[PDB]
Amino acid sequence: MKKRLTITLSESVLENLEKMAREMGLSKSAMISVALENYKKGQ
Amino acid sequence: MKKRLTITLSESVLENLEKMAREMGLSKSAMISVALENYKKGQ
Amino acid sequence: MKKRLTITLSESVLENLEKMAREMGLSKSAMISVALENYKKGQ
Amino acid sequence: MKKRLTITLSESVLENLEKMAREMGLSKSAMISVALENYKKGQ
DNA sequence: GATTGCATTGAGTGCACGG
DNA sequence: GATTGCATTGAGTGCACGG
């Protein structure tokens, strides 16, 4: 059910990822997953 | 300075990552980066 | 930064947790974390 | 039939789990269960 | 830039060859 | 019902003693 993948991100977008996941106590993989879902929704 | 990140995503979330990316004419890294900056906005 | 804890939940709330985390490709620990955060916010 | 679940939470998210729980006069399991049913609502 | 195999440590990540 | 130590496998969970 889980697949790996390597992405490239802006040194500033990644630094932001950090903070966000941190306050939400999430992993980047989870924060990303949350954000992806989120976005999908708002679409 | 751009940096790389190896993450793990749920097949279903990945599948939809692809879908959304195609339709937005962006790469996964790009899509993810959008959604990420988006969530930060939505608050 | 991470701490363990054992909770007790309704057979129906847990069954729901399942679905939700599943579609969001999240762990319960993550889904719960998301939901907790969420709630905090709406407060 | 009620069931048990051992989860892992980020200290900061746990700390705020406690805060919110106290103030709502509920147990963590209870709080978590609320928030969980809540998110499902918010959609 | 991207995909992946090798590797490790509490799946999610790093690293680097091969593209 | 809750906390925790023991245990395992891709931290997040199960299991069960002790409460």
Swiss-Prot record, chains A, B, C, D:
The gene is copG. SUPFAM superfamilies: Ribbon-helix-helix. InterPro entries: Arc_rbn_hlx_hlx (IPR013321), CopG (IPR002145), Ribbon_hlx_hlx (IPR010985). Residues 16-36 bind DNA. Belongs to the transcriptional regulatory CopG/NikR family. This is Protein CopG. Pfam families: RHH_1 (PF01402). GO terms for molecular function: sequence-specific DNA binding. One of its GO terms (biological process) is plasmid maintenance. Regulates the plasmid copy number. Binds to the repAB promoter thus controlling the synthesis of the plasmid replication initiator protein RepB. Homodimer. It comes from Streptococcus agalactiae. GO terms for cellular component: protein-DNA complex. Keywords: DNA-binding, Plasmid, Plasmid copy control, Repressor, Transcription, Transcription regulation. Induction: Represses its own synthesis.
